[PDB]
Swiss-Prot record, chain A:
Residues that bear Phosphoserine: S65
Subunit structure: Monomer. Interacts with GGA1 and GGA2. Binds to clathrin and activated ARFs, such as ARF1, ARF5 and ARF6. Binds RABEP1 and RABGEF1. Interacts with the membrane proteins M6PR/CD-MPR and IGF2R/CI-MPR and the accessory proteins SYNRG, EPN4, NECAP1, NECAP2 and AFTPH/aftiphilin. Interacts with TSG101 and UBC. Interacts with ADRA2B. Interacts with NTRK1; the interaction is independent of NTRK1 activation and ubiquitination. Interacts (via VHS domain) with BACE1 (via DXXLL motif).
Biological role stated in the UniProt entry: Plays a role in protein sorting and trafficking between the trans-Golgi network (TGN) and endosomes. Mediates the ARF-dependent recruitment of clathrin to the TGN and binds ubiquitinated proteins and membrane cargo molecules with a cytosolic acidic cluster-dileucine (DXXLL) motif. Mediates export of the GPCR receptor ADRA2B to the cell surface. nvolved in BACE1 transport and sorting as well as regulation of BACE1 protein levels. Regulates retrograde transport of BACE1 from endosomes to the trans-Golgi network via interaction through the VHS motif and dependent of BACE1 phosphorylation.
Written domain comment of the UniProt record: The VHS domain functions as a recognition module for sorting signals composed of an acidic cluster followed by two leucines (DXXLL motif).
Organism the protein comes from: Homo sapiens (Human)
Family designation: Belongs to the GGA protein family.
Residues of the full protein shown: 211 to 300 of 723
Protein name: ADP-ribosylation factor-binding protein GGA3
Effect of substituting S73N: Can bind RABEP1. Confers an affinity to RABEP1 identical to GGA1
Phenotypic consequence of L70R: Loss of UBC-binding and ubiquitination
Tissue note: Ubiquitously expressed.
Top-rank taxon, per record: Eukaryota
Curated annotation (Swiss-Prot), chain B:
Location of cross-link Glycyl lysine isopeptide (Lys-Gly) (interchain with G-Cter in ubiquitin): K6, K11, K27, K29, K33, K48, K63
Record PTM: Phosphorylated at Ser-65 by PINK1 during mitophagy. Phosphorylated ubiquitin specifically binds and activates parkin (PRKN), triggering mitophagy. Phosphorylation does not affect E1-mediated E2 charging of ubiquitin but affects discharging of E2 enzymes to form polyubiquitin chains. It also affects deubiquitination by deubiquitinase enzymes such as USP30. Mono-ADP-ribosylated at the C-terminus by PARP9, a component of the PPAR9-DTX3L complex. ADP-ribosylation requires processing by E1 and E2 enzymes and prevents ubiquitin conjugation to substrates such as histones.
Natural source organism: Bos taurus (Bovine)
Residues of the full protein shown: 1 to 72 of 128
Protein role: Exists either covalently attached to another protein, or free (unanchored). When covalently bound, it is conjugated to target proteins via an isopeptide bond either as a monomer (monoubiquitin), a polymer linked via different Lys residues of the ubiquitin (polyubiquitin chains) or a linear polymer linked via the initiator Met of the ubiquitin (linear polyubiquitin chains).
The protein's name: Ubiquitin
Site location (Interacts with activating enzyme): R54, R72
Length: 90, 72
C-alpha cells in the first residue's frame, strides 16, 4: 500500500483515542499490550501530522483550509507531547 | 447481540456476537466481512486493548456498545 491523506475527523479520532489510553495508563498496572498499542497510536499521530504538513505545503495563496490543517496538526502535536511528558518524562 | 466497531476514519461495522464470544472471535468476524487480517487488528474499549484470550464478557461489553478498531 502507498501513502494517503487523513480527514480532520480521523485526526481527532486518533487524538481522542490516544487521549483515552494515556489517561487509562499506569506504569504498574498497564501491561505491555496497552503500552504497545499506545506506541502505534503515537506513531500514527506522528505520521498524520506529517501528511498534514504535506497538505500545508501544497496550499495556495489565500487558502481557505490552511487554518484547519495547522489547527489539526497543533492538536496532534499537543497529544504527541503528552505521550512524551508521561510515557517518558519530558 | 449487536455491537459497533468504530475505525479511526469514522467507519462503523455492526457485529452480531454473544457475551460469550472471545476477542479472537470478534477479530475473525471482522475479517469475514471486511477482510482485515486479525493480525493487523487491535481493539480498544475504555482506553484498554483487548486480548484474544479474554472474552467480551470479561471487559463488560453490553449491547450497542462501541469498540475501537486500529489497524497497524
Amino acid at each position: 500500500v502507498t501513502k494517503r491523506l487523513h480527514t480532520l475527523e480521523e485526526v481527532n479520532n486518533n487524538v481522542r483515542l490516544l487521549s483515552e489510553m494515556l489517561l487509562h495508563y499506569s506504569q504498574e498496572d498497564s501491561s505491555d499490550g496497552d503500552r504497545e498499542l499506545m506506541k502505534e497510536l503515537f506513531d500514527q499521530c506522528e505520521n498524520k501530522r506529517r501528511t498534514l504538513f504535506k497538505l500545508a505545503s501544497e496550499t495556495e495563496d489565500n487558502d481557505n483550509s490552511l487554518g484547519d490543517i495547522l489547527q489539526a496538526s497543533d492538536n496532534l502535536s499537543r497529544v504527541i507531547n503528552s505521550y512524551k511528558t508521561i510515557i517518558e518524562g519530558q | 447481540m449487536q455491537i459497533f466497531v468504530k475505525t479511526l476514519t469514522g467507519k462503523t461495522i455492526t457485529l452480531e456476537v454473544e457475551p460469550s464470544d472471545t476477542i479472537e472471535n470478534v477479530k475473525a468476524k471482522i475479517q469475514d466481512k471486511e477482510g482485515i487480517p486479525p493480525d493487523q487488528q487491535r481493539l480498544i474499549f475504555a482506553g484498554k486493548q483487548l486480548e484474544d484470550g479474554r472474552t467480551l464478557s470479561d471487559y463488560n461489553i453490553q449491547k450497542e456498545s462501541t469498540l475501537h478498531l486500529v489497524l497497524r
